[PDB]
């Protein structure tokens, strides 16, 4: 290490990695958002704008690989032991670690995802599910699913509980199967097989706001909704293209917003990590689509230095709000409108960091002896070809320094539609900047 | 609707309702505290439905199936008649000091000849993807004392360039071996062509027709064997002020004169005479003509369309299959008449494929509109007022009909992609 | 009104249900005594007329339909509820035909932009708007008038807008699914439009199935091609028929080949398709032989094109003749 400078924080970041967020409702007036830097986690307010409420300390020594936030605590799994890195799970509360989770010693797997309910927490690694009693924070059992094939035994997609099922977990195989296990006895009770078995893997799964119906997203493409005790399929949808699989899905519990009248419920948002677009379906009659949101972030590309995607969707508690965190260090919260009908939501909140590394870095001189001062504003010229004024004081009061109605320019053109792209429209990247507030009168 | 799988752990399990504060309000009587797991999950179902009532989707057709299909939503052609996927591309970096005389595209490769009345020719390769100079300059050739009026690519393969201006002589440059010929005698017509101004080369690259400086009641011009550079024929029509414009047919055997007052004359070589005369309808005086198309009257050269631009400024477009009556309608009817520019049209040109018709006047700022065949209407979404054309002087389609080149009278040629 | 305050409580449905009478003084008086802040957001276009009492015209209502989708949405919902409750009536459906036709006409008349993905995406959004009503009216089986009106709107949708072949065939497929016999000949006109503006040369299956189900095919087809240019439809038909290995389509194939409706190019490529079908087949071949000798002994330019197509494929008519006759 060093002798002068101690590490304090990595900024320019709201959600750049692949890990999705986690979202809890506080009371009937706020929603907590929780996102991983990659070496920490922050929790934002929803009603109070998108300022930062909690910053997670101390830093995990390794890259975080899973998280979820309960009523008070932040549960974060870090560490892919497949390459050197020590792993663990920690329990924070209000940005500070209160506890640590006892790992099994025989875990040579990175730990994929986290779920909490009842008095139990369940954690899915790669093909392996470990359980702790949450009331004691103690290791209870370890679930080991089995398949005939080295491929098919892989636990891709994920797992969920139904709201009305006592102690039952629903996991997706690398095969198209969903397995129900009772966690109390740790026993695989049931499994369900994919209809039209050309579809390969459960890429995702989500309970619906109705009772005992699971939606399953297949890497082979179909979105299905099924009764989960009757094993009764409610609907098929051909929405996933073959090499363009869907990422995830959510339903609107706000109670209205379908059927083109405003007078109907049951809307699905879905998204694919191949795109930057998302999709909206009215589920009532034919499960029709109604609306494409085109390029809600930058879509991922390997030909370009641009980094992005869509790591999640969520409908929050019963309101027009939907969060999408991408991989383009990107959150934009969207809003359903009431007085007209609209296909799409419009944006209502945003936070952004770059989609590429930072080229140049500079500070602002003092409001000559005042408060805007030495250490408030830092200008960053990012290889995403942009200029950002970052606030060391309160990270929300940082902003972009726009170049105009550029997004609307793209929307009038087709940069958001399907030529160049949006970084190619914004000015080229940044060699070197200099500032002087000796006239900068605000 | 029978439940497929069953558990025994729920019958084994029981829960204390009155002890549970959250679950306290879910009882039916003030006696139910210890409740089995199956009844407990049933009360959970009641609580959940009381929280949220059941939805109607929780209670095929071809386009409904297409509708639920999302592969239905994913992000040169032949081109539809009212708009164009048009895209202005990079500009030629080298300018001209004088007004632009002409443009010419090479028939095989994307090679462009720009030509200025500053006695100067430029050759460029079309390369938007070039560095650090897109659309690179091949050559800058200057010809002394000789302001270029017009030049032509000779060869369907495009091997030579002839160029001719206000001087009484013209030149042929063979690119292979790079040789120059200064032709200065048309075998007894040296009082008869005091210029070499207007000329047209056959599409087969065989015949060169030069107009005459003797108007006096009727235009005349000479046909030349190109490879031999010799007088082979002459055509002469009776009008008022001589030759307005003229063009071969798609074969290169017969041709068309338009002279002022709008008189158009078809003339075949195998008969070595004028096929006939007709009138561009109501045009008081023509200034430009052009001829293009396929699948027309093969006896009249198989080309489909004739373009007539008159000194008023109206654009008369006709179908030669409708020109037939080998007999000729003396008063043909307009397939399409065009009143979308005020002053006299400066230059008009056909696309190679037979779809597009570019036309413009030069007295106004940027008089240029574009026509789709065979609907014969304008493209109402290009060009804008702030489309930087200039007082247009030269218009060339590319060989493959993907590229538009235009040039004003200032020395600034610009380029467009015609995407269909 | 004077008991149930309907003008205040059910402004939208009352306003829509008197909306198709936009030149009568009863409608004028309704406009007189509505409350302004109660008029629906879709319906707030009459505000100049409620300032100045005068019956608004169709141009005004439809211009709002163009650059206001939701008016069309609401009137579509009313009239489809009318036909779903079987209480449709000719004034209603004629009004609704004029409304949708000029409406979507204006919608494309802006939606053509010139920018490539923009026109594709705009057509997407348009399709999402018009989806439910056009499907319900394409297969509204009890109401032939709204079937005709759906024919109208999707026909203009085809002929004007440069739509993609899959969407076009999907329109074809629902129309196939939904027609009747009183609607038969007009639906044939629609398929002439649809296949005529199609770009690919073949039809997708069930369309050909129902066109076999069509009773008076070549007679109706000559009647419509008297003014309508049905050639791409006939070509897609015969492609689908030689693709089908069923042998009950052969009288239809023979009649359409003699019909003098397809081009010489279409006729020769269909004849080569039929002989390659005879080459791939493994009686059946006896029916193929009787059909092929009928076509080769056809009299006019159809038979002449068949014989010259035999000449250009260079296979022996005598070989197959004696092979099927022996």
């Amino acid at each position: 290490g060093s002798a002068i400078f101690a590490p304090y924080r990595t900024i320019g970041l709201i959600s750049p990695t692949g890990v999705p967020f986690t979202s809890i409702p506080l009371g009937k007036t706020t929603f907590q958002i929780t996102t991983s830097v990659g070496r920490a986690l922050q929790t934002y307010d929803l009603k109070r704008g998108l300022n930062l409420v909690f910053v997670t300390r101390p830093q995990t020594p390794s890259d975080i690989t899973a998280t979820h936030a309960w009523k008070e605590r932040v549960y974060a799994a870090f560490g892919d032991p497949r390459n050197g890195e020590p792993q663990g799970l920690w329990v924070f509360q209000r940005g500070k670690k209160v506890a640590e989770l006892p790992l099994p010693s025989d875990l040579d797997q990175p730990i994929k995802q986290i779920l909490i309910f009842g008095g139990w927490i369940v954690a899915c690694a790669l093909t392996r599910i470990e359980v702790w009693k949450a009331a004691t924070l103690e290791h209870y059992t370890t679930i080991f699913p089995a398949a005939s094939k080295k491929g098919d035994n892989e636990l891709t997609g994920g797992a969920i509980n139904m709201p009305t099922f006592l102690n039952k977990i629903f996991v997706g195989r690398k095969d198209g199967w969903v397995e129900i296990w009772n966690v109390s006895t740790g026993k695989l009770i049931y499994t369900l097989l994919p209809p039209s078995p050309d579809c390969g893997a459960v890429t995702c799964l989500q309970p619906t706001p109705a009772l005992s119906l699971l939606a399953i997203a297949y890497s082979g493409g179909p979105l299905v909704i099924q009764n989960v005790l009757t094993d009764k399929t409610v609907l098929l949808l051909e929405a996933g293209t073959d090499d363009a699989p869907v990422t995830s899905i959510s339903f609107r519990t706000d109670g209205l917003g379908a059927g083109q009248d405003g007078r109907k419920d049951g809307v699905m948002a879905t998204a694919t990590s191949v795109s930057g677009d998302v999709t909206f379906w009215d589920l009532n009659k034919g499960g029709r689509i109604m609306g494409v949101l085109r390029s809600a972030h930058n879509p991922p590309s390997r030909h370009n230095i641009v980094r992005g995607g869509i790591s999640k969707i969520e409908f929050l508690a019963g309101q027009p709000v939907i969060v999408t965190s991408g991989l383009d260090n990107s959150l934009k919260t969207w809003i359903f409108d009431e007085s007209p009908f609209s296909p799409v939501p419009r944006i209502l909140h945003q936070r952004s960091g770059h989609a590429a590394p930072v080229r140049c870095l500079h500070f602002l001189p003092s409001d000559f002896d005042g408060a805007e001062g030495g250490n408030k504003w830092l200008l960053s010229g990012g290889k995403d070809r942009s200029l950002w004024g970052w606030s060391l004081r309160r990270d929300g009061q940082s902003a972009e320094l726009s170049q105009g109605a550029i997004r609307k320019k793209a929307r009038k053109m087709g940069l958001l539609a399907g030529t160049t792209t949006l970084e190619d429209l914004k000015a080229p990247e940044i060699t070197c900047i200099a500032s002087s507030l000796n006239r900068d009168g605000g | 609707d029978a439940p497929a799988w069953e558990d025994s752990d729920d019958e084994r399990l029981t829960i204390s309702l009155a002890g549970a504060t959250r679950l306290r309000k879910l009882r039916i009587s003030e006696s139910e505290d210890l409740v089995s797991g199956i009844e407990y999950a049933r009360r959970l179902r009641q609580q959940y439905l009381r929280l949220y009532p059941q939805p109607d989707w929780a209670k095929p057709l071809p386009l409904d199936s297409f509708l639920r299909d999302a592969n239905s939503f994913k992000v040169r052609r032949k081109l539809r008649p009212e708009t164009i996927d048009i895209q202005r591309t990079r500009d030629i970096p080298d300018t001209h000091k004088a007004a632009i005389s002409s443009l010419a595209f090479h028939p095989r490769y994307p090679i462009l000849l720009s030509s200025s009345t500053s006695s100067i020719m430029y050759l460029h390769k079309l390369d938007a993807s070039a560095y650090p100079t897109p659309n690179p300059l091949l050559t800058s050739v200057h010809v002394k004392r000789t302001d270029l009026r017009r030049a032509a690519f000779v060869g369907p393969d495009g091997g030579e360039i002839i160029f001719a201006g206000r001087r009484r002589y013209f030149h042929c440059w063979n690119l292979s071996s790079g040789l120059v010929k200064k032709v200065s005698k048309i075998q007894g017509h040296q009082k008869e062509q005091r210029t070499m101004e207007r000329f047209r080369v056959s599409p087969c690259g065989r015949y060169m027709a030069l107009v005459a400086s003797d108007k006096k009641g009727g235009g005349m011009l000479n046909i030349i064997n190109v490879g031999t550079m010799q007088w082979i024929a002459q055509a002469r029509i009776d009008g008022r002020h001589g030759v307005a414009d003229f063009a071969w047919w798609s074969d290169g055997n017969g041709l068309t004169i338009a002279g002022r007052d709008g008189q158009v004359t078809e003339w075949s070589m195998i008969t070595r005479r004028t096929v006939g005369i007709w009138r561009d309808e109501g045009s008081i005086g023509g200034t430009v003509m052009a001829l293009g198309g396929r699948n027309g009257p093969a006896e009249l050269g198989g080309d489909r369309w004739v373009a007539i631009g008159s000194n008023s400024g109206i654009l008369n477009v006709y179908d030669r299959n409708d020109l037939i009556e080998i007999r000729i309608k003396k008063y043909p009817t307009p397939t399409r008449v065009f009143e979308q520019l005020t002053t006299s049209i400066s230059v008009v040109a056909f696309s190679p494929d037979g779809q597009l018709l570019a036309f413009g006047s030069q007295h106004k700022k940027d008089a240029l509109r574009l026509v789709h065949l065979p609907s014969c209407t304008v493209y109402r979404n290009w060009p804008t007022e702030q489309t930087p054309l200039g007082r247009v002087t030269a218009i060339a389609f590319s060989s493959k009909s993907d590229v538009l080149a235009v040039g004003n009278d200032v020395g600034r040629v610009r380029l467009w992609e015609i995407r269909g | 009104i004077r008991r149930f305050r309907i003008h205040e409580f059910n402004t939208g449905t009352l306003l829509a249900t008197f909306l198709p009478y936009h030149t009568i003084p009863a409608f004028v008086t309704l406009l007189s005594i509505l409350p302004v802040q109660r008029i629906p957001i879709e319906y707030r276009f009459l505000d100049p007329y409620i300032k100045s009492l005068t019956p608004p015209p169709r141009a005004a209502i439809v211009q709002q339909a163009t650059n206001r989708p939701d008016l069309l949405s609401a009137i579509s919902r009313y009239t489809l509820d009318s036909c779903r409750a079987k209480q449709e009536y000719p004034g209603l459906i004629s009004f609704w035909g004029g409304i949708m036709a000029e409406a979507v006409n204006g919608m494309i008349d802006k939606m053509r932009s010139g920018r490539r993905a923009i026109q594709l995406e705009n057509d997407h959004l348009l399709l999402q708007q018009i989806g439910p009503v056009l499907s319900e009216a394409m297969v509204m089986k009890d109401v032939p008038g709204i079937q005709i009106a759906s024919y109208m709107v999707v026909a203009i949708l085809a002929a004007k807008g440069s739509l993609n072949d899959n969407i076009l065939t999907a329109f074809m497929e629902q129309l196939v699914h939904g027609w009747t016999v009183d609607t038969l000949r007009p639906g044939l006109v629609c398929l002439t439009m649809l296949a005529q503006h199609r770009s690919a040369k073949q039809l997708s299956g069930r369309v050909a199935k129902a066109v076999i189900k069509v009773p008076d095919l070549v007679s109706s087809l000559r009647d419509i091609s008297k003014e309508h240019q049905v050639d791409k439809l006939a070509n897609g038909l015969v492609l689908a028929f030689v693709d089908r290995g069923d042998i009950r389509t052969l009288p239809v194939i023979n009649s359409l080949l003699l019909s003098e409706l397809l081009q010489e190019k279409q006729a020769k490529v269909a004849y080569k398709a039929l002989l390659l079908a005879a080459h791939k087949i493994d009686n059946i071949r006896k029916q193929v032989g009787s059909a092929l000798v009928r076509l080769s002994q056809a009299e006019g330019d159809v038979g002449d094109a068949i014989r010259t197509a035999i000449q250009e494929v260079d296979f022996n008519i005598e070989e197959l003749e004696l092979k099927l006759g022996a």
Binding site: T29, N161, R346 | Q47, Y52 | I41
Partner: peptide, 22 residues
């Protein structure tokens, strides 16, 4: 002016606790 979305507000909406799934 019509067609306008109002000031966004938090709506009150009750939820189901899954913490009782033990």
């Amino acid at each position: 002016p019509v067609g306008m979305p109002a000031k966004w507000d938090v709506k009150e909406a009750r939820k189901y606790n899954i913490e009782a799934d033990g």
